[PDB]
Design a protein around this nucleic acid. Sequence first.
DNA 1: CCAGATCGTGCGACACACCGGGCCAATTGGCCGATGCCGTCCCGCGAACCCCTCTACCGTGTTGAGCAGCAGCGGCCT
Length: 48
Amino acid sequence: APVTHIWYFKGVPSRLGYLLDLAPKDLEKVIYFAAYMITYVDDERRTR
DNA sequence: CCAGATCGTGCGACACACCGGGCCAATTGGCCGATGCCGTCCCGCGAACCCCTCTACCGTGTTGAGCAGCAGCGGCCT
């Protein structure tokens, strides 16, 4: 299974957080299997 | 003065100088040929060597200092 690099996750400032605009707590929750993340949504289909 | 050392000279011996002959001793050193023991290998069996599998009373919780970013809150502004 894929894993993350600790240098680009933990070190302040959280580079992943800055790039994706995620607070470090949310990122830590996601990567360490504590909450889901929505990675795709079909806006036009649901609106129709 | 004059007689032996030194040297001249002479006669002989002569130890080889030659450069050429004519045979030989010692001493071979090869493996010739024949005989014999060891290295390698191909099984043969067996001791051990490692891996996998299953057992059903039941049983249910682990210092100080320096610098920077984030969360909560007081208080405008709409």
